[PDB]
Design a protein around this ligand. Sequence first.
Ligand SMILES: Nc1ncnc2c1ncn2[C@@H]1O[C@H](COP(=O)(O)OP(=O)(O)OP(=O)(O)O)[C@@H](O)[C@H]1O
Lengths: 107, 102
Amino acid sequence: DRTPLVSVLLEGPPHSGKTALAAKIAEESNFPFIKICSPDKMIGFSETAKCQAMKKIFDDAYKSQLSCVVVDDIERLLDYVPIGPRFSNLVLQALLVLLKKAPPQGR
Amino acid sequence: KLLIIGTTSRKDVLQEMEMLNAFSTTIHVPNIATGEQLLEALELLGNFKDKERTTIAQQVKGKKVWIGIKKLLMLIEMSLQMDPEYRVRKFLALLREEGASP
Ligand SMILES: Nc1ncnc2c1ncn2[C@@H]1O[C@H](COP(=O)(O)OP(=O)(O)OP(=O)(O)O)[C@@H](O)[C@H]1O
């Protein structure tokens, strides 16, 4: 009850099957609310559209009582590339903020 | 079911961008690298006849080559515009000048 918000990161080399395991864990939770925010549903979106979609999903999660959410392929969610490097600062700031926000009491 | 084929000409750049991981395999397309292959190509195209082919053979059969087919067609076309008795020499000069740099 003292820690309403919890986070965890799955790490590994490529072609290891991280997404499958994450999905399986989420399925076994049996929580009322489950959602997956994959980058392949937002092909061609600019930065603002991505921010808004993520915000909407997280609000919907906030509405319910207890929830679990999955975020996969972070390095693709914010456009990373070794040359440069280059990426979207806006999305990084959005994620850094959202990871430290607690939902309304009792949830 | 879907199949995707992709073409390129600079593998290393794609390697740096971390793109070769996406593809499932790779295939290599080579150039012409021997006198026999060049002579066979000429014969198939049939631009140069027997005596000219023999002359070209004696000139080139004892060396190595580095050229692409699409460039070979253009070289032949450029050569053909000269007079009937100068074509072979100009063709050989162009082939020499192109440079190999394997
Ligand atoms: N023991 C296992 N653990 C996880 N996935 C497994 C296992 N055995 C078979 N699979 C299957 O392997 C696939 C897992 O590949 P997946 O795309 O999830 O990996 P990935 O690390 O996300 O790949 P990429 O790094 O390219 O995004 C799925 O089809 C999954 O069902």
